[PDB]
Design a protein around this nucleic acid. Structure first.
Lengths: 99, 144, 56, 158, 49, 114, 139
RNA sequence: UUGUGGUAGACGAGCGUUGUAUUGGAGUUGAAGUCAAAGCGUGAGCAUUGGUGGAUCCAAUACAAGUGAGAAUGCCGGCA
RNA sequence: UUCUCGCAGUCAGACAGUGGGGGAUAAGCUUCAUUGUCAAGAGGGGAAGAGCCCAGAUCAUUAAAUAAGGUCCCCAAAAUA
RNA sequence: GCGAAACAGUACCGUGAGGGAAAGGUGAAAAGAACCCAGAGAUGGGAGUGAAAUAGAUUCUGAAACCAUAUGCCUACAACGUGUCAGAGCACAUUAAUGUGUGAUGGCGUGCGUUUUGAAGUAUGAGCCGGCGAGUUAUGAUAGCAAGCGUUAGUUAACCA
């Protein structure tokens, strides 16, 4: 029915055939992974996680979120620096999560 | 990061509700009335939507307060000029338009919002029971 | 007798929107082929009912 | 310079009661025109002291570099003669050894006018005295008509 | 080398120029004091003073 | 010697002015006001990136408690129950979406009762 | 079409001009002329003659219909102002600016030429994206 | 592992343009500037496409700077 | 933390606790001593609270645990006795 | 750049010492707008020439600000350094990007540079835009760095070719 995935420390409840974005994890683009850090597939709850149940995840793209313009300026003190933090992401979907 | 938790697509629609205050205490009724007007209990309640409901209060002349606050507490409201402070005790408002107090006291607990103006209007206080809102098919309940 | 700042563009446009003017009067001439205005003359010598002046 | 302005630098202002800068000196460095303090100065020394031993080391270095590569090759005094001012024969000789690729300089020490009168229209090639050459000239030429006489003379002269 | 390209050997060390920019760090003053005779232009301890 | 650089200055001003648009009146037309608005908007973006996750967490606290009050129970008791025994990983906003899943949050409700 | 008629800097205040200029906008070919003949303002006769010349131009050079015409647009663009001075007491002089307005009037027949400019702009952006795309291809 | 609060203050590493040097190059079958865009950049910057005008300019490396703008009740010019 | 070399900047300090001198054991007082802060460092709270408390900001984050403090509502969390 | 590219020390200021300004660019060749509609005309519009009428004597090009016009957005019950993060709704498809144009509504949010112990401050300065615009050099000393030579060692000035 769906799947809870813990990417880092961030959870995603994503249903079947939904392409969504997580933090970049150097995943292979366009390939298939048996992800284990999963929970709550379909009325299915395990105490620490979903034992003997893993999700089958395919990736579509690797990109970066738009440039976070981090600026450090102090008023009337002349401490001003600029940088761009483009946090990367992996856009992926679940296909045939196994039980 | 984000999973885009869902909201209603301007699907807000309110319902008429009935209540009578005879053995009711101002603050005790006011908290639940505010929760009803905001739709505070609802899970889809967002501060920019306020999926509340219409509230009808029948026989506001029967509300009761405890202690000596009827003769001890006082309510101030200053007009535009000096001496415009109408300062009325509870016993004064017992023999006067206490419905206005029912309005303003709850309004005082309203969110600091441009549209709290628009939801304080959702409360219709009546010292009797005659109104065309009876023909609007209202849903009666207790401790609204 | 001094202001503080310049009038903003939007405020200036709103204040000069008060200068909007209505229309003049109107009257279609009968013995004159022109089109005059109400309670006024028409340049055909006739104020209305009869010739009252020169053609100019 | 700031002391080359024209006219008395009197104030057309007052010391007070002015809503803008006083600027007692009229042609200020920030005011339009006049009032140079630093600017461009022809007083530049143009001198960076160099030592003879390091210079000789550099000359030997560049000689070793070009002797090991030797894009150019030995040329004798005989061919320097019997030639006219004509770049016709000069260019014919260059294309005979396809010498139009290198911007060759010719080192001269015998002062033969036959080759000297040439190499003056096509500016890819030119002639200069061997003792008047420089590493700037040497690496730019990429080839040099190295004289027959100078070989042992240059080796002894280092 | 060649006439078209050349690279140094740790020449042109870091310089110190004043009067230009404050985001460049340590700008117009970079050690010029504050409200002092020596804080002024051409103002510095005279060897005979 | 005079160096010709009278164009890169305007290039700089246009580069700084490009981000300024959609502002009321004369706040994306002048250069210095554009600089100041850029600074203020950058500070606002920074404070958002600082505290919006806190704001969303508090919003989930309120909404999850309201759901719990809709179920006739308090937030504190439910959080204690979840934390004390049979610890899971389900998150607050994911729990809110499970509330949006009708009778699926109630499955947890009689699950924590068990 | 456009029936553009330009005046190029008569001495008239943009504030003063624009009032009648845009008050005479929106009407048809003649219901503007007749009402303009009845207004007691300085900016009446000059713009009436300008409009008459524009109508004659449209009817002669292009030979348009002449009946479906309407006042499509009137604007008072920046006419170069003049700089002089006037004396004030205590021996002073204050700068005076003499107004003007680059006056131009445009008349349209069909209820169009508004979307046509949008189509030209879209063609421009299409040629832009095509030029970019052929750069993106041919790898 | 410390790391990154940081003015002043000390210190480092890079960027842009002008001209020289050479190596290359584009150019009326269209240089540069400008503007528009729903780009790349880590900030200095690099673009690209398109438009206007029609002839100069871009890039690789070293050198040299009247080299790097927000105020200066900054100067000039235009417009309020 | 000791030393050499070079470059510094700082002076008009302030706040609160504790010792105070003067006052009047008056200061939003002056002067010094220690502690902590700001100056030189933002943030959570108290209605805001330059120096009060909690605590020391790589960045992105619709994650968890807490500190001060809080849990009728405004604006977030409890009632049991 | 000589103030001084033009007929600039001109204009202009004062009685006089003295000062003391602004302004260059048609196009390849005028190849300069023949004829016509309106007016009084300039002019505009046609036309006509020249590849080129952003090529009209306004004449190398033609920025910013500003002024207006309307396409699509919304605003006439509303206590806001006017923005930000979410976002309805409206209209779209691109420098394909979980898009762009706009933003009902919610939350947060007292400018800048200055000297100040310390202002968001009713301290300070700013009408705005655009152009210019303020740590250099000559010689000498010293410390570091890089390089050469290097132990009767390195080194010229003045200079001469």
């Amino acid at each position: 029915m769906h799947a809870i995935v813990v990417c880092g420390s961030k959870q995603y409840l994503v249903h079947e055939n939904d392409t969504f974005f997580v933090e970049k994890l150097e995943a292979p683009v366009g390939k298939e992974i048996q992800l284990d850090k999963v929970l709550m597939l379909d009325e299915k709850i395990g105490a620490p996680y979903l034992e003997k149940a893993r999700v089958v995840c395919v990736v579509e793209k690797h990109g970066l979120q738009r440039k976070v313009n981090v600026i450090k300026h102090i008023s009337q003190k002349h401490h001003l620096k600029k940088y761009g933090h483009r946090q990367p992401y992996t856009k992926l979907k679940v296909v045939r999560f196994v039980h | 990061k984000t999973s885009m938790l869902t909201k209603e697509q301007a699907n807000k629609r309110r319902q008429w509700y009935i209540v009578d205050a005879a053995g009711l205490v101002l603050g005790k009724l006011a908290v639940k009335a505010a929760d009803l007007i905001r739709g505070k209990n609802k899970v889809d309640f967002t501060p920019n939507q306020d999926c509340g409901d219409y509230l009808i209060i029948i026989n506001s002349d029967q509300v009761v307060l405890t202690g000596n606050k009827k003769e001890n507490e006082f309510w101030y409201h200053h007009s535009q000029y000096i001496g415009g402070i109408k300062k009325v005790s509870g016993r004064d408002m017992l023999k006067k338009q206490s419905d206005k107090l029912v309005y303003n006291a709850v309004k005082g607990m309203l969110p600091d919002n441009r549209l709290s103006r628009r939801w304080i209007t959702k409360v219709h206080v009546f010292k009797g029971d005659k109104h065309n809102m009876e023909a609007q098919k209202p849903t009666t309940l207790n401790w609204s | 007798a001094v202001q503080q700042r310049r009038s903003s563009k939007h405020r200036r446009d709103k204040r000069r929107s008060h200068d909007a003017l209505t229309a003049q009067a109107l009257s279609v001439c009968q013995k004159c082929g022109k089109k005059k205005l109400f309670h006024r003359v028409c340049s055909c010598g006739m104020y209305g009912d009869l010739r009252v002046k020169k053609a100019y | 310079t700031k002391g080359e302005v024209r006219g008395g630098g009197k104030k057309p202002y007052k010391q007070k009661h002015t809503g803008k800068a006083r600027q007692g000196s009229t042609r200020n460095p920030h005011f339009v025109g006049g009032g140079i303090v630093f600017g461009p100065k022809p007083n530049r020394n143009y001198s960076l002291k160099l030592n003879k031993k390091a210079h000789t080391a550099a000359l030997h270095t560049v000689w070793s570099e070009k002797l090991a590569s030797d894009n150019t090759h030995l040329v004798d005094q005989n061919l320097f003669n019997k030639t006219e001012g004509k770049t016709k024969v000069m260019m014919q000789f260059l294309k005979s050894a396809k010498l139009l690729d290198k911007n060759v300089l010719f080192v001269v020490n015998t002062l033969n006018t036959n080759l000297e009168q040439s190499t003056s229209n096509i500016k890819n090639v030119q002639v200069k005295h061997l003792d008047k050459v420089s590493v700037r000239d040497l690496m730019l030429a990429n080839a040099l008509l190295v004289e027959k006489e100078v070989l042992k003379a240059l080796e002894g002269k280092f | 080398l060649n006439q078209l390209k050349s690279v140094p050997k740790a020449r042109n060390h870091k310089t110190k120029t004043l009067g230009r920019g404050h985001g460049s760090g340590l700008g117009k003053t970079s050690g010029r004091g504050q409200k002092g005779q020596k804080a002024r232009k051409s103002g510095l301890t005279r060897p005979g003073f | 010697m005079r160096i010709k650089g009278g164009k890169q200055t305007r290039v700089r001003r246009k580069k700084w002015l490009k981000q300024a648009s959609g502002s009321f009146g004369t706040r994306h037309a002048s250069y210095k006001v554009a600089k100041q608005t850029v600074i203020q908007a950058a500070k606002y973006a920074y404070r958002d990136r600082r505290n919006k996750k806190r704001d969303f967490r508090s919003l989930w606290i309120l909404r999850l408690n309201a759901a719990l009050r809709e179920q006739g129970m308090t937030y504190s008791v439910f959080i204690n129950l979840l934390k004390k025994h049979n610890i899971e990983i389900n998150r607050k906003v994911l729990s809110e979406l499970a509330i949006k899943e009708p009778s699926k949050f109630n499955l947890i409700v009689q699950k924590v009762k068990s | 079409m456009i029936a553009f008629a330009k005046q190029f800097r008569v001495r008239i205040s943009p504030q003063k001009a624009r009032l009648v200029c845009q008050l005479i906008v929106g009407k048809k070919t003649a219901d503007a002329q007749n009402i303009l003949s009845n207004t007691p303002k300085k900016a009446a006769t000059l713009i009436a003659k300008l409009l008459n010349s524009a109508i004659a131009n449209a009817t002669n050079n292009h030979g348009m219909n002449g009946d479906a015409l309407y006042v499509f647009e009137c604007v008072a663009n920046q006419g170069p102002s003049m700089k002089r001075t006037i004396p004030r007491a205590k021996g002073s002089s204050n700068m005076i600016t003499k107004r003007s307005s680059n006056l131009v009037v445009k008349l349209s027949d069909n209820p169009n030429e508004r979307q046509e400019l949008i189509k030209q702009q879209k063609a421009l952006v299409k040629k832009r994206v095509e030029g970019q795309q052929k750069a993106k291809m041919a790898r």
